[PDB]
Amino acid sequence: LDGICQSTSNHLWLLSDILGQGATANVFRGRHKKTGDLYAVKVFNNISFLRPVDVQMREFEVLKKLNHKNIVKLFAIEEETTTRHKVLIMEFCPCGSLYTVLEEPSNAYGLPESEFLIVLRDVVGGMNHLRENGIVHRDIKPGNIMRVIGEDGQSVYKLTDFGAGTEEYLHPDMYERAVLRKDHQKKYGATVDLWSVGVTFYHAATGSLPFRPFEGPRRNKEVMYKIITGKPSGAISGVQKAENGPIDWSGDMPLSCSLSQGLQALLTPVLANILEADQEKCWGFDQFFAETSDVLHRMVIHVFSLQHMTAHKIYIHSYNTAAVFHELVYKQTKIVSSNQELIYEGRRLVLELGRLAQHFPKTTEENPIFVTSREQLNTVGLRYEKISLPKIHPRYDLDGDASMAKAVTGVVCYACRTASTLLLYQELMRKGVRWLVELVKDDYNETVHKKTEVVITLDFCIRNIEKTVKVYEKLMKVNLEAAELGEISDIHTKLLRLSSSQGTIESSLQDISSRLSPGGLLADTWAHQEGTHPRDRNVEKLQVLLNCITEIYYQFKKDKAERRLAYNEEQIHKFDKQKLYYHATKAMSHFSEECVRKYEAFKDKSEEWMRKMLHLRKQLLSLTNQCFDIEEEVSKYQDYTNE
Amino acid sequence: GLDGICQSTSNHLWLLSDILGQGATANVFRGRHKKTGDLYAVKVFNNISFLRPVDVQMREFEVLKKLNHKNIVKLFAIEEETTTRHKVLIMEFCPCGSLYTVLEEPSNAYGLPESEFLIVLRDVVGGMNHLRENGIVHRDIKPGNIMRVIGEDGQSVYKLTDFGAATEEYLHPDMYERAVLRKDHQKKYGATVDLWSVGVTFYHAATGSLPFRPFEGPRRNKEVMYKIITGKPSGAISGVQKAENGPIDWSGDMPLSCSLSQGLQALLTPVLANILEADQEKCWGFDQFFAETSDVLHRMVIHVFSLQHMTAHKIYIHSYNTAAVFHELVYKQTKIVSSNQELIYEGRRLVLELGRLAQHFPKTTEENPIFVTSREQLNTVGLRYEKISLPKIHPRYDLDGDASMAKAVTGVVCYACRTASTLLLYQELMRKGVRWLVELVKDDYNETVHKKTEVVITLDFCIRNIEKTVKVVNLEAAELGEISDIHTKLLRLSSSQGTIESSLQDISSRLSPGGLLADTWAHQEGTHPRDRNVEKLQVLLNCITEIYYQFKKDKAERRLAYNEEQIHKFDKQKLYYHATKAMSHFSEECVRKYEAFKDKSEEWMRKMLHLRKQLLSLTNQCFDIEEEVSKYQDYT
């Protein structure tokens, strides 16, 4: 009620300090009386006293020995002081659960990918420890996945809330409860465990539940069953999308899902074979644990395609060769291995086919391995979902206002992440186009170094046989020096065919030097005009508005909790409702007019510039190979200049 | 069913509990516009009484109400409180509090971060100037009355506030003192007194401490304080009585604990030393102060990192400034001359055109800098930080003491934690630089071998002229004479070129990936991002911070209830446990590995400059051969 204490001989807690209200028990924040440390206390209701206590504490001992991260620690079983009944002393996770985590508006459309992999890593490692200690757990939900801050800062998710007549005189209606007790037991077949796990993973990935009838999954109790027991093999989500219209299946993550394409490629097949009605084609734990832990042991290399203007996470094993790296890059970019040029920190990147992934250059999302083709490729862009504000109910409703506020915060929150990615795409494009231009400079500079090596061996052979005409026709027979000879006069005209046709190699190579020059025809002048920039501060401008909308939303929650407001406080709440819509719209249209429009203008100026640069690299290649054709042409003619 | 906690005007209301400020003449409450609900700060003069008739300070307020400038907090209206008729000024509410509450955070115990500092400097100077333009200055600018607003773009906007706008033969000898003489020697000091306060504020913002301290705190020792600010040598900006009643330690530089860039310190220390000067002349004037500071603010900043000193650098340069002064500015901090500065940007070498404007330099950030290295030998300096240790935590239960103790401790672990982060940057940058330098030398190698082979197909081709089956059986005029001396040099040129290739290969085997200049120490020694050392520290710093914030609350209560007392006593042990763990982690893991990486880079640098000398000698050797063969190429 208020200022009420329960205690054991070793802990105490306030009934008001309640963390968790379940049907069988309640959990409280408590302290160890002598040290002051914080523990959670699980105290059981009056209806949890319906199975013997000899086998109830049999369950609890076998749990008190479970020692493992990803499992909340059970420290002791003690007895309350005044009343005498059993309480569990557990590990206190002050950060709450994955449920409170998904309840934030930042995770309104799914967790960020780095955190998802942790939920995945930790939930799978928890189940495995439970399966190994002979414990089934089918109630795995965000509600009872706890979150702890590990001492390195990254989250650690931990599992919890798991356990360890005479027939011939019966009325035929009551005889049906004497045959559906052993026969209606459509026995579970051990693959039931990971249906929850699969729903949880979809929830954490997308911010929404996988199977949803319109009006909610709970208001429409019946259409729910039609969806679960009718989902095609491989389908991942079923949504009504209509007041009462047909249901819409899909085996893909929603567009709103921001996880990398690489990861969805790994993740969808897992969920597809984890959500399955029969035991035969549905996965077993041996296969689930083996297939998932394969995703966990992969490292991530960030590559960015300049031709496409698209980022890519490459999920690859530490022991995989450079060959599989190229394949994985092809699977996302449609650029074949023999067409992949890698650029890293300004210089090209050669992969020796024996090189292992662990020895690759370290990458971050903002320091990626760029990949470009010499062939033509159309720019794709960042594929995101176009989300706009919900309609604002003019009713003064404290429940409805808090819900509308959560939604608006989550939409502006999404626009704010997207706008951030749009700036990275533009900033990475600029970082890459800059280097690509400098690599065509190395390619041009190499061609000139070879040309000025062949132009001087061509010359030392021409004046080497022309100076024998200075002795054959000037000092001896003195006649017209024009009549042709047999053997050498055919290789003399063949050399003049090289020296003169190479003169027009310079006139075209000089043109490509000029268009590749700084103020030239291929300058990256669009890159410094056509986008948004870090100095525009569009992200933090949005953030500033999102902070106001968020501050209102948190308040509208406290208003809902207070259930009904005083007079001045009601007018402020009403005033702040208009303020919230003002800020949201100010943000959403700024997302449209400043972030998106200037990004699209930049995306299109890069498709123009991309065609231009590909053409030039094709010309410079055509000229480079002529220098090797003139290289071998003088190779067979030079040793003939022996005398 | 009772009132007396709600004041109002005809247009605003406020709760006497929502008090934002207290002062001798008035208080300031957070209030609302009755018709619109918008928040304003309302200042209510409950003791307006002074030596100043109300008509003087009322014409003042009408003057301030016209002010409209981004660094003044707007005075919207002058109103009368509904029931007491007290004058109330309603004005713009800055929910972020003041520069005082900012400098009170433990993360600013040792000065503001540079970016924020520049903002305070810009806006304080901006408001100050707008005041002069309207014929007001107060000499009373201090953090207490500089408000902070979050701008549309999320950057702070500081705003000035709380400034005004405008017998005898029958008396004792001790009354004749002050009645006709001593209260008459008020020399109405002006013009230069104003800046002293702004100087102390900027020092305080920049270091997190006050510039003049008599060991007992400026307030508890009233006397020594006056002895400091009146005997301060010209050019000094801080005087501190280090020990109990010791001499005063004068200094004219920032303290090591000051995280401000060496570039900005060089600009700031002058405008402090000339602002904190206690005479009519020798001190600066407004017009010079505004121009001199305006010079710092109109400067852009280019980031450069010295691979050989292992130090980062901010270069405060004008956009119209020429590349030649960029080198000057790098010389001032690096002590390496302009003819010695090789510049590297994004994996490639940078060419300072000697005349290009800084406006057109490549964009840089603290982590994407321009690197600088020379061919000459340089000793690694590393980050200069101050080594700050946890204070002594005394074991008594004292609510005032423990609050003061937790604040100090939180501050030390922020400095530790921030310093730990910079150490990681210097290593991550160092590695990016070494990697890039090694590839540049590979370009200087490939450039040399490209001309070595370019010249051998001239030696072997011009030897095939004067030394083939064409040149040179009894003969006496068949060329065996003065041309045979050139064929001799050309033979010793082709043979000496032999051992050029032998030494040229030897350096390729050290530039190779496995060779004895491979940057293998770089990925073994020192700390890495994957080590998560900063966020490890951060996790402890959050425990410590949460406790300090609760110990503030306890101090406020002055008396803790029974259980709370005991929890507070346990949290004080937790606080000391977290802090000593964070501190020893900073020492034995961040610093210890950083220094190991530092010494491994000094050793690897010696090997690098020794190879670059050699490769150079081989390059010059080829231009020599090109020179000496381009002479004999032209024969007759």
Partner: peptide, 12 residues
């Protein structure tokens, strides 16, 4: 949408 009346000073 509306219904936002002005603030008052008799809490009743």
């Amino acid at each position: 949408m509306e219904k936002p009346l002005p603030l008052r000073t008799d809490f009743s």
